[PDB]
Amino acid sequence: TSGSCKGRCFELQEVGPPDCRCDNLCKSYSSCCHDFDELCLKTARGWECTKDRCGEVRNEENACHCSEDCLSRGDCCTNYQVVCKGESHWVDDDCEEIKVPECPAGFVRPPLIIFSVDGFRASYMKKGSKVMPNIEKLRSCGTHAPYMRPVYPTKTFPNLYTLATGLYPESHGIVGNSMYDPVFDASFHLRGREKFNHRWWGGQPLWITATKQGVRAGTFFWSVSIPHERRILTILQWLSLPDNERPSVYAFYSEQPDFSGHKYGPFGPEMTNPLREIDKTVGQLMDGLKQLRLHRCVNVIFVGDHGMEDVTCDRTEFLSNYLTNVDDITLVPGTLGRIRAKSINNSKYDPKTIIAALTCKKPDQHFKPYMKQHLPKRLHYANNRRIEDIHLLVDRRWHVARKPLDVYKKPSGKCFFQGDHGFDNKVNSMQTVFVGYGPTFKYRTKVPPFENIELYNVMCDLLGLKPAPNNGTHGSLNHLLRTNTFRPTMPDEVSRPNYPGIMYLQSEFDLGCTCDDKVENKLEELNKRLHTKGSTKERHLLYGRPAVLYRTSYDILYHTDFESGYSEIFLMPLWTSYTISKQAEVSSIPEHLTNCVRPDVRVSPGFSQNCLAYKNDKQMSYGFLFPPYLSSSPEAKYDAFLVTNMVPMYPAFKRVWAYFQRVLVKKYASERNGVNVISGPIFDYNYDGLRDTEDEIKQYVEGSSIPVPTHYYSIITSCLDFTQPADKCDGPLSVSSFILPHRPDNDESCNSSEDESKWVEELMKMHTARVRDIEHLTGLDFYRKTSRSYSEILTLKTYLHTYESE
Numbered sequence: 001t002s003g004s005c006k007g008r009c010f011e012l013q014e015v016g017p018p019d020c021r022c023d024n025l026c027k028s029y030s031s032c033c034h035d036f037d038e039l040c041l042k043t044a045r046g047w048e049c050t051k052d053r054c055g056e057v058r059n060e061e062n063a064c065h066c067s068e069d070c071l072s073r074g075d076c077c078t079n080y081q082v083v084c085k086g087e088s089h090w091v092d093d094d095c096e097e098i099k100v101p102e103c104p105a106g107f108v109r110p111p112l113i114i115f116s117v118d119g120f121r122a123s124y125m126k127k128g129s130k131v132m133p134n135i136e137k138l139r140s141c142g143t144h145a146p147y148m149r150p151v152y153p154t155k156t157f158p159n160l161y162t163l164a165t166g167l168y169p170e171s172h173g174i175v176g177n178s179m180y181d182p183v184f185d186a187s188f189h190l191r192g193r194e195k196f197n198h199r200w201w202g203g204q205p206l207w208i209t210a211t212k213q214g215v216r217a218g219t220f221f222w223s224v225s226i227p228h229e230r231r232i233l234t235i236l237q238w239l240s241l242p243d244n245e246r247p248s249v250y251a252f253y254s255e256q257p258d259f260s261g262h263k264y265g266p267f268g269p270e271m272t273n274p275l276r277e278i279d280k281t282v283g284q285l286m287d288g289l290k291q292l293r294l295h296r297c298v299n300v301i302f303v304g305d306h307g308m309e310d311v312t313c314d315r316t317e318f319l320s321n322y323l324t325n326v327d328d329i330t331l332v333p334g335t336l337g338r339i340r341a342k343s344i345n346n347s348k349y350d351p352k353t354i355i356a357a358l359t360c361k362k363p364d365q366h367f368k369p370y371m372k373q374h375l376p377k378r379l380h381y382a383n384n385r386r387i388e389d390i391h392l393l394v395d396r397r398w399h400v401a402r403k404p405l406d407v408y409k410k411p412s413g414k415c416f417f418q419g420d421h422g423f424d425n426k427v428n429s430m431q432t433v434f435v436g437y438g439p440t441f442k443y444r445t446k447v448p449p450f451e452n453i454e455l456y457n458v459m460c461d462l463l464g465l466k467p468a469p470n471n472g473t474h475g476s477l478n479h480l481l482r483t484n485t486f487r488p489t490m491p492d493e494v495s496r497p498n499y500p501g502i503m504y505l506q507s508e509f510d511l512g513c514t515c516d517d518k519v520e521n522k523l524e525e526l527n528k529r530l531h532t533k534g535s536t537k538e539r540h541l542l543y544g545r546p547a548v549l550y551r552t553s554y555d556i557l558y559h560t561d562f563e564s565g566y567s568e569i570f571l572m573p574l575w576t577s578y579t580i581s582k583q584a585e586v587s588s589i590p591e592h593l594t595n596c597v598r599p600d601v602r603v604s605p606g607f608s609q610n611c612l613a614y615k616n617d618k619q620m621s622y623g624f625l626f627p628p629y630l631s632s633s634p635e636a637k638y639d640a641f642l643v644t645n646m647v648p649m650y651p652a653f654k655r656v657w658a659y660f661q662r663v664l665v666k667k668y669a670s671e672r673n674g675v676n677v678i679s680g681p682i683f684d685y686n687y688d689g690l691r692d693t694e695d696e697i698k699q700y701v702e703g704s705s706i707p708v709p710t711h712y713y714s715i716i717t718s719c720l721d722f723t724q725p726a727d728k729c730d731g732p733l734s735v736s737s738f739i740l741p742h743r744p745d746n747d748e749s750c751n752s753s754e755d756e757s758k759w760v761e762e763l764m765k766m767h768t769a770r771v772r773d774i775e776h777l778t779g780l781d782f783y784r785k786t787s788r789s790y791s792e793i794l795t796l797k798t799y800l801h802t803y804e805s806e
């Protein structure tokens with residue numbers, strides 16, 4: 001309450017009561033000293049030097065200075081050298097490679113300045129290029145991606161705090177712009193004081209990582225009323241502090257273009273000016289750095305949080321059109337929906353009835369309901385008590401609301417928003433920007449699109465920090481950097497495989513299985529043993545066997561057409577690997593073999609599944625990981641019916657799996673010039689995105705110890721140069737992968753009553769995944785043996801095939 005900001009303007013360490021505050025957040029708290037506006041928010045004469053001000057006598061009342069002592073004081077207007085000393089604007093200088101940091105004496109490391117822009121959609125870089133010369137120079141001279149993928153939901157606070165932490169929102173806890181925490185019994189909103197409480201904010205953001213390791217860094221937050229020109233001048237003044245006091249990491253935040261984009265839509269004619277204004281702010285920063293002789297010293301990152309889509313009030317779905325009992329729910333509305341019971345601890349609120357009432361009710365329905373554990377695993381949006389059990393994924397360009405009165409406000413509801421964001425993070429309009437410029441970034445370099453979760457590790461590298469544990473894959477963005485301080489290495493294999501031979505006679509098994517395999521030589525007798533010993537393994541295991549990164553007991557099983565790693569604990573393969581060439585032939589399962597399952601004489605009865613359990617379980621059927629349809633010969637096809645290739649499958653899911661195996665695998669082999677497929681089960685009953693231990697499994701095949709997978713994955717690899725076949729590729733690889741939910745119905749697919757050709761591939765595309773997602777869910781490590789660099793393989797493992805257009 002009481003005291004003064006004299007000598008304290010934008011102080012870096014925040015003070016507690018009794019003392020009032022003078023730091024860059026005091027306005028948000030209504031806790032600034034009474035003279036903060038007078039001393040710290042000077043506006044007199046605006047932000048630019050003019051010719052008549054050059055060499056003026058210093059007037060301490062001015063916003064910034066054009067007096068001769070201003071460089072020494074560190075408080076010149078940013079254009080001072082241009083107007084008063086014949087210098088050129090940074091933007092007017094030619095791009096010149098920054099091979100080494102060119103820093104003043106006393107600089108122990110290149111500072112990092114993070115320039116974050118709210119709502120800056122990726123395509124602004126092309127579509128607004130004529131009005132953003134400073135930004136276009138950073139982009140073309142530095143390192144840029146064509147776009148950067150935000151996290152879900154594609155909202156401001158979840159994405160900004162992901163930038164700062166390298167964590168998914170479910171881990172850092174900022175799961176939306178609005179949230180309710182049922183343990184706190186409290187709500188977080190963009191406006192208000194509740195968000196000030198540290199209890200909402202988990203993980204370890206960069207400013208804390210830096211400070212713990214002796215690198216000075218304040219928080220990245222800004223009070224909204226502090227104008228942009230003053231934020232830039234404040235950063236430039238901090239950069240003028242003595243070496244022992246000066247931060248090494250800085251954050252500028254702009255509320256634009258998002259603020260205007262909501263009002264005018266992403267490409268409204270009103271959007272040109274906010275793009276020009278952000279560009280001018282970038283120019284002020286670069287000119288100011290150039291004055292301080294820091295423009296070839298500092299690393300600058302120009303980064304957005306999310307993009308912006310066209311969304312209008314008339315494109316609103318109302319839950320009151322679907323639910324008779326809409327007053328029994330609370331909805332977090334908008335470009336996503338989150339539903340919970342209106343009254344806490346209510347015994348007779350049924351999420352299953354709500355889901356049903358919201359499922360495929362109108363043909364053009366513009367949202368889909370999910371239990372959060374059923375959302376695509378790529379969204380990583382479930383493991384937090386602030387995420388409601390019922391989630392509505394809203395179509396791009398749409399909103400969901402509970403009742404019409406929520407949207408059309410009195411008198412009679414006019415709209416007055418035309419843009420919004422928050423949709424699925426694969427949606428093109430939600431993609432945002434990344435540019436890195438400075439001595440540590442590459443020169444004039446384009447990099448592929450990547451996810452914002454990866455940036456925290458890079459920012460730690462840029463500062464010489466060890467990153468806190470996060471969801472980036474450290475090394476996957478080494479290709480952005482001229483000088484890398486991190487050398488990634490493969491995780492050590494924890495469990496070594498057994499390689500069993502023929503150890504059991506047929507009569508030792510009592511599995512209740514049958515197969516018509518007795519029917520029908522010395523030439524093909526040796527060839528069989530060779531195949532069982534691994535003679536075709538270099539064809540079907542193209543990138544080495546996967547490493548198992550936890551303690552377990554498993555066997556490598558070789559066959560003519562496929563190899564597998566068979567878990568004696570889970571009684572099924574952890575992975576099955578097989579290559580299908582462009583020329584491969586699809587065949588049927590012969591009539592006489594429809595219900596064939598065969599004991600595997602390499603694997604004990606005690607470590608085998610059994611057909612009786614499947615007969616008895618009236619809900620559960622089975623399928624096979626290596627598909628019998630893709631056998632190389634009628635004789636090799638018998639290997640596909642081994643009990644060691646069988647996995648539990650609901651009949652509903654078998655429709656999906658059989659279409660993938662019979663139709664799609666061969667299609668991809670045709671289109672990609674062969675594919676290598678690795679398939680397997682995933683168990684994630686606690687929806688944490690991580691491999692379950694055996695004591696976490698909640699469902700088994702009835703009367704057995706056969707665990708039921710929650711999902712089934714495949715990783716489908718080929719040669720990036722598709723003129724070379726998958727099995728003879730000399731260069732970089734191409735991958736697409738999926739994690740399909742193992743569900744007892746196809747309620748997710750509204751067209752599922754149609755032939756699989758009309759709906760299965762759409763479902764698979766929705767559940768596209770990165771190899772890294774499968775690695776977390778399985779405890780396996782892939783691509784152990786390739787001819788490619790490890791950094792390149794880490795980039796491959798973070799790739800997501802999105803299926804969007806351009």
Ligand SMILES: *[C@@H]1O[C@H](CO)[C@@H](O[C@@H]2O[C@H](CO)[C@@H](O[C@@H]3O[C@H](CO[C@H]4O[C@H](CO[C@H]5O[C@H](CO)[C@@H](O)[C@H](O)[C@@H]5O)[C@@H](O)[C@H](O[C@H]5O[C@H](CO)[C@@H](O)[C@H](O)[C@@H]5O[C@H]5O[C@H](CO)[C@@H](O)[C@H](O)[C@@H]5O)[C@@H]4O)[C@@H](O)[C@H](O[C@H]4O[C@H](CO)[C@@H](O)[C@H](O)[C@@H]4O[C@H]4O[C@H](CO)[C@@H](O)[C@H](O)[C@@H]4O)[C@@H]3O)[C@H](O)[C@H]2NC(C)=O)[C@H](O)[C@H]1NC(C)=O
Nearest residue numbers: 170171172173202203204383384385468469470471689776
């Ligand atoms: C994405 O990356 C992240 C980060 O690597 C991955 O998330 C990590 O996942 C780990 C495994 O699940 C998990 O380990 C837990 O940790 C428990 C301790 O957790 C607290 O302390 C953490 C460390 O804090 C310190 O270091 C950090 C540096 O990062 C500093 O910032 C801190 O200030 C500290 O110095 C802390 O990060 C963690 O934060 C969570 O909880 C906070 C308060 O609720 C939230 O504010 C915050 O947002 C985090 O919330 C997330 O994570 C929790 C789970 O921790 C989750 O519930 C939330 O929904 C949200 O997702 C805490 O403050 C530790 O007790 C655990 O050990 C128990 O379980 C294991 C078995 O799983 C046993 O081996 C062990 O013996 C022990 O068992 C005993 O206790 C059990 C009950 O806990 C009991 O049932 C049992 O019977 C036993 O008695 C375990 O190690 C990390 O916490 C987690 N980190 C984060 C930030 O989320 C994530 O998995 C990656 N995702 C993917 C898909 O790969």
Ligand SMILES: CC(=O)N1CCN(c2ccc3ncn(CC(=O)N(C)Cc4ccc(C#N)c(Cl)c4)c(=O)c3c2)CC1
Nearest residue numbers: 025028157160161164195196201219220221222223253
């Ligand atoms: C964790 C912690 O140290 N806390 C909790 C938050 N507290 C706090 C106190 C005051 C504030 N004034 C203003 N704004 C608005 C704002 O800063 N924007 C919109 C930009 C922005 C920048 C970086 C991140 C990031 N990362 C985020 Cl998400 C948002 C606040 O968000 C704000 C927050 C400070 C103490």
Ligand SMILES: [Ca+2]
Nearest residue numbers: 684690691692
């Ligand atoms: Ca799990």
Ligand SMILES: [Cl-]
Nearest residue numbers: 155176177178
């Ligand atoms: Cl939200």
Ligand SMILES: [K+]
Nearest residue numbers: 614617620621
């Ligand atoms: K059955």
Ligand code: NA
Nearest residue numbers: 746747749752
């Ligand atoms: Na359906």
